[model samples]
Target: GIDPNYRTSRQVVGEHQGHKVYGPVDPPKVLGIHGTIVGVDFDLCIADGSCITACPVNVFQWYDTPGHPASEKKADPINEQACIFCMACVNVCPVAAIDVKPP
Candidate 1:
């Protein structure tokens, strides 16, 4: 279960393949790695669409999440394999909810 207000003061946690949201309890490691993005933290995401616009390869798309407590939509890195490690999306995310790593 995801806390509706988890993002109020919680930092984004990274995951791999799974959409599960982690927190400070056992945050997913996301520093100093090189790979395509494998997960997104919808809990912290504000559905600002920054990741979709920042990705040069069109790796991300809008995933509608009706009734979502935090956002109505989330960025889904569908074309993650096409990523070029540009880090544009990672840098543009205001909430820092996106995590990209090597395959």
Candidate 2:
């Protein structure tokens, strides 16, 4: 149901549900705490901007789609340096797709 070779800034494309799909990769360096924080899940995400507002560190960003791509909806990770691992985004996500772990 997904497509392969469809990679985002933090995810790689693969096959899923008889279709190529994108999956989460290693967590961004911004979330890394003492080399403990590794990767995060981004594909299953609903693209809600709750994480953007929940983050006090401003680690997330909302990018506008040129023509509003179907798969390219909502916001994505543009800047991660401000992530504080407060898990506020995880808690605020209405889809329950956000997860944040600390080292």
Candidate 3:
């Protein structure tokens, strides 16, 4: 059973992808290792953040390479457990810079 206040809080502070929200309150002290980056294409990515919003796990940080200015690397996988394997990030990404698989 969920408390009405908790549900209301969720609605009030509802979080979507891209925006960083404080979570896993009491998350384990162990820091999670980053996941594997399957592919990267400088020409493809525009760093639009569509993938960021799509990802549920909050992986993929905007990293800018020195030479490449227009597009940034979507690197870093912070919360993999939140990843629903929905593949929404890959589909929405303007430049395909993400790939995830069970190892």
Candidate 4:
């Protein structure tokens, strides 16, 4: 699972697939948070598909992570901008890795 303090403990170290990446990132393994409004701690994500199934706007897609520790694939926040702030994905994640910040 993602650190409960990730918003405070992590830094905006980079970006991935168009979203902000919060570190401690080490690439290929520790992929970090993939968004600000809809972040997913790639290191904790288990590709459970719960988030994808819960999303109302289809904000995620199956993305191959190659050699990630959690899983070979993840529910990538590819269309995060379309999020309606329903908190559906955040609440459904079995690993509790998704973090959606609403306005």
Cα shift from native, residue 32, model 1 (Å) = 22
lDDT of 4 by residue, 67-95 (tens): 88889998888788989999989888998
Identify the leading candidate in terms of lDDT.
Answer: 4
In terms of TM-score, the best-performing candidate is: 4
- Candidate 4 has what TM-score? 0.88
**Backbone atom clashes (below 3 Å) for every candidate:** 4, 7, 0, 0
* Model 2 Cα lDDT, one tens digit per residue, 62-88: 543333323244334444444577777
Point out the higher-scoring one by lDDT: 3 or 4: 4
Better of 2 and 3 by TM-score: 2
At residue 47, what lDDT does model 2 achieve? Answer: 60
Ranking by lDDT: 4, 1, 3, 2
The positional error of residue 101 in candidate 1, measured at the CA in angstroms, is 0.4
TM-score of 2: 0.47
How far in Å is the alpha carbon of 87 misplaced in model 2?
1.0
Better of 2 and 3 by lDDT: 3
**RMSD vs true structure, all candidates:** 8.8, 10.9, 14.3, 1.5
TM-score of each: 0.64, 0.47, 0.46, 0.88
True lDDT of residue 92, candidate 1: 80
Q: Among all windows of ten consecutive residues in candidate 2, which has the lowest summed lDDT?
A: 29-38
Q: lDDT per residue, candidate 3, 33-88, as tens digits?
A: 12332222323455677867767666666654434444334344446445677777
Better of 2 and 4 by lDDT: 4
